[PDB]
Symmetry: C2
């Protein structure tokens, strides 16, 4: 998108596990002064797409490479990952964390969520699992979990209603809960008036996210 | 995934606009003999990922490059894209196709759906639009449309319930309806016994998709 230019276009790259949950809320609450070009990326594409001008802003998670001096950021929200699974028809989990080699529905090895989930499982040797299904898309993992195919770590904002309906059941609310923080990243350099307006309004919007 | 190997792993690459709608139905109805590694791709990555052994199968649409002799295929289903938008609170479309420069929510220029949608708009000079929001994810376009941000062409399987609820309203059921066909692609070469079992069972499953 380096050569691509309009007066109003905002070029956003967003992590796979974050696009659907976050973009509609921003698009709906932003002033009607922008147009949007958004592409889903893996976490490690973000550095180069910002520096090469392919994206104006990155919607990602905590990134040590991006929280340094050449970039600027604002924390959009924090959330938590819960291990969940479908119910057993009686309001109880269909699977148990203690089952030897329980079916795990995981994010990809090169994803931010996957790294923290694998780090968590490693520290808890009391848990053995067999990886049944791997995908980068949060909503794909969510649906596969809802269908009863195993246990998945999913962020609270994506499963809020399903926890209320009981279609998904939380398996642990303490040691296996993983904290996550979502950030918007940009270059420290001054940008166009429309992009600077977008950044200003996104900060003012952050409280309501 | 060339070096990655297990006895049961099936490596699938699926187009962005197709992953969420199709993968859960396959995963749920397949025999419990496989594990799944699925990554979302753009349409034009499929040729090389098949030939280089990075994916066992591709879930994509009609692809002239992939329907040739070196590859084999089975049509999973056909569908249709409908231009839809949110309601106006009275059971009528919030937007009209005849509005000068109506807000369009489009797939990306390098997507299969985007090419056919743009081809359709070009042939219909009676329609002027302003592109408000571009994304590869079908479910992101769907949510942005549901929130009332403009008109989007979306496949019937993704909006079936919303058309019934009236949360989305079809704007045309004739000249602007775009036909689409979803295929599973593989190399014509003989594969492992587990992948050949997967291909056999996917054919037997196709009728129920």
């Amino acid at each position: 998108g380096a050569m691509d230019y309009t007066l109003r276009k905002i070029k956003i790259a967003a992590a796979h596990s974050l696009s659907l949950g976050l973009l509609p809320t921003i698009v709906k609450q932003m002033p009607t002064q922008f147009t949007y070009a958004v592409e889903a990326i893996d976490v490690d594409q973000a550095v180069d797409m910002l520096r090469e001008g392919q994206s104006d802003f990155i919607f990602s998670y905590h990134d040590e490479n991006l929280q340094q001096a050449p970039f600027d950021n604002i924390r959009l929200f924090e959330s938590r990952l819960f291990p969940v699974c479908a119910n057993n028809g009686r309001g109880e989990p269909r699977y148990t964390l203690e089952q030897p080699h329980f079916p795990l529905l995981n994010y990809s090895q090169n994803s931010y969520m996957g790294r923290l989930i694998n780090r968590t499982l490693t520290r808890h040797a009391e848990l053995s699992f067999s990886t049944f299904f791997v995908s980068s898309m949060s909503e794909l993992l969510k649906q596969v979990a809802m269908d009863g195919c195993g246990i998945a770590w999913l962020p609270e904002y994506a499963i809020r209603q399903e926890i209320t309906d009981g279609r998904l059941i939380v398996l642990d609310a303490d040691e296996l809960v993983i904290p996550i923080q979502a950030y918007a990243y940009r270059m420290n350099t001054r940008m166009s008036q429309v992009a600077e307006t977008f950044w200003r309004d996104l900060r003012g919007l952050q409280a309501a996210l």
